[PDB]
Design an enzyme around this catalytic site. Structure first.
Site, PDB file in Angstrom:
ATOM      1  N   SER A 152     -12.120 -19.896  -6.114  1.00  0.00           N
ATOM      2  CA  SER A 152     -10.747 -19.744  -5.398  1.00  0.00           C
ATOM      3  C   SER A 152     -10.790 -20.157  -4.150  1.00  0.00           C
ATOM      4  O   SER A 152      -9.842 -20.976  -3.367  1.00  0.00           O
ATOM      5  CB  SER A 152     -10.398 -18.503  -5.627  1.00  0.00           C
ATOM      6  OG  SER A 152     -10.254 -17.938  -6.944  1.00  0.00           O
ATOM      7  N   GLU A 155       0.754  -1.299  -0.070  1.00  0.00           N
ATOM      8  CA  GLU A 155      -0.015   0.116   0.184  1.00  0.00           C
ATOM      9  C   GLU A 155       0.943   1.210  -0.001  1.00  0.00           C
ATOM     10  O   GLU A 155       0.488   2.225  -0.343  1.00  0.00           O
ATOM     11  CB  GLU A 155      -0.860   0.063   1.172  1.00  0.00           C
ATOM     12  CG  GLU A 155      -1.941  -1.330   1.164  1.00  0.00           C
ATOM     13  CD  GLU A 155      -3.186  -1.075   0.162  1.00  0.00           C
ATOM     14  OE1 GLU A 155      -3.820  -1.885  -0.150  1.00  0.00           O
ATOM     15  OE2 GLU A 155      -3.140  -0.216  -0.688  1.00  0.00           O
ATOM     16  N   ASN A 187      -6.914 -19.985 -10.772  1.00  0.00           N
ATOM     17  CA  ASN A 187      -8.443 -19.279 -10.567  1.00  0.00           C
ATOM     18  C   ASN A 187      -8.347 -17.816 -10.057  1.00  0.00           C
ATOM     19  O   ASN A 187      -9.181 -16.811 -10.582  1.00  0.00           O
ATOM     20  CB  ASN A 187      -9.347 -20.081  -9.875  1.00  0.00           C
ATOM     21  CG  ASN A 187     -10.778 -19.777  -9.884  1.00  0.00           C
ATOM     22  OD1 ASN A 187     -11.140 -18.982  -9.005  1.00  0.00           O
ATOM     23  ND2 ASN A 187     -11.470 -20.232 -10.785  1.00  0.00           N
ATOM     24  N   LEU A 192      -8.905   4.210   2.760  1.00  0.00           N
ATOM     25  CA  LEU A 192      -9.847   4.739   1.642  1.00  0.00           C
ATOM     26  C   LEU A 192     -10.899   5.581   2.461  1.00  0.00           C
ATOM     27  O   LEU A 192     -11.404   5.255   3.401  1.00  0.00           O
ATOM     28  CB  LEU A 192     -10.778   3.703   1.192  1.00  0.00           C
ATOM     29  CG  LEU A 192     -11.924   4.312   0.155  1.00  0.00           C
ATOM     30  CD1 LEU A 192     -11.521   4.924  -0.972  1.00  0.00           C
ATOM     31  CD2 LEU A 192     -12.997   3.117  -0.262  1.00  0.00           C
ATOM     32  N   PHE A 213      -8.373  -6.361   3.007  1.00  0.00           N
ATOM     33  CA  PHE A 213      -8.211  -5.172   3.269  1.00  0.00           C
ATOM     34  C   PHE A 213      -8.110  -4.438   1.915  1.00  0.00           C
ATOM     35  O   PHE A 213      -8.858  -3.131   1.758  1.00  0.00           O
ATOM     36  CB  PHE A 213      -6.552  -5.123   3.601  1.00  0.00           C
ATOM     37  CG  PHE A 213      -6.163  -3.978   4.010  1.00  0.00           C
ATOM     38  CD1 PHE A 213      -5.717  -2.765   3.071  1.00  0.00           C
ATOM     39  CD2 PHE A 213      -5.984  -3.393   5.392  1.00  0.00           C
ATOM     40  CE1 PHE A 213      -5.125  -1.444   3.344  1.00  0.00           C
ATOM     41  CE2 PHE A 213      -5.474  -2.186   5.741  1.00  0.00           C
ATOM     42  CZ  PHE A 213      -4.818  -1.140   4.794  1.00  0.00           C
ATOM     43  N   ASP A 222      -6.429   6.583  -5.233  1.00  0.00           N
ATOM     44  CA  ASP A 222      -5.659   5.215  -5.114  1.00  0.00           C
ATOM     45  C   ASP A 222      -5.684   4.862  -6.700  1.00  0.00           C
ATOM     46  O   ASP A 222      -5.978   5.698  -7.457  1.00  0.00           O
ATOM     47  CB  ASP A 222      -6.308   4.409  -4.341  1.00  0.00           C
ATOM     48  CG  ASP A 222      -7.939   4.033  -4.761  1.00  0.00           C
ATOM     49  OD1 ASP A 222      -8.568   3.313  -3.885  1.00  0.00           O
ATOM     50  OD2 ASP A 222      -8.324   4.315  -5.849  1.00  0.00           O
TER      51      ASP A 222
END
Ligand SMILES: [Cl-]
Ligand SMILES: [Cl-]
Length: 162
Positions: free
Chosen positions: A117, A11, A132, A32, A104, A20
């Protein structure tokens, strides 16, 4: 390496409001603020998040405080979610960090959408889950980060981060 160091790599840290990868107002370590196009809406979410009049700038301590809250929230969203919790409980400590990373980044609802998945991860079919996971908007929009997370699920080691 742990979840905090992993997400700090993925990040970055910025102390002033920024957009972002999706164009949304964000601050700190991928915190965010709002999906709204308005910088004033962002500044007001920021002041409310920090509890003071920030004018779009926060300190490192404040960035790290939001980060701790966001990691905690991601973990709590996994454990409260009927689709995510059993996958998380099935995983070793390293792959658990990969799941937290995804939550996250994209939220519990978004990750719960990776039904196939998640089933492969629960069954420990690592090579197949990795294939996948890559068939996703996630992988095509942020391929370098997604590759690091996918590698972590595939191998159960921190090698993509060292
Ligand atoms: Cl907050
Ligand atoms: Cl990326």
């Amino acid at each position: 390496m742990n979840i905090f160091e992993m997400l700090r790599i993925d990040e970055g840290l910025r102390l002033k409001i920024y957009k972002d990868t999706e164009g949304y107002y964000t601050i700190g370590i991928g915190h965010l603020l709002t999906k709204s196009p308005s910088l004033n809406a962002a500044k007001s979410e920021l002041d409310k998040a920090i509890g003071r009049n920030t004018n779009g700038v926060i300190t490192k301590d404040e960035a790290e405080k939001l980060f701790n809250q966001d990691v905690d929230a991601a973990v709590r969203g996994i454990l409260r979610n009927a689709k995510l919790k059993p996958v998380y409980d099935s995983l070793d400590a390293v792959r658990r960090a990969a799941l937290i990373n995804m939550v996250f980044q994209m939220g519990e609802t978004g990750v719960a959408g990776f039904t196939n998945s998640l089933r492969m991860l629960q069954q420990k079919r690592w090579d197949e889950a990795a294939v996948n996971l890559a068939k996703s908007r996630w992988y095509n929009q942020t391929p370098n980060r997604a590759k690091r997370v996918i590698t972590t699920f595939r191998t159960g080691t921190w090698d993509a981060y060292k």
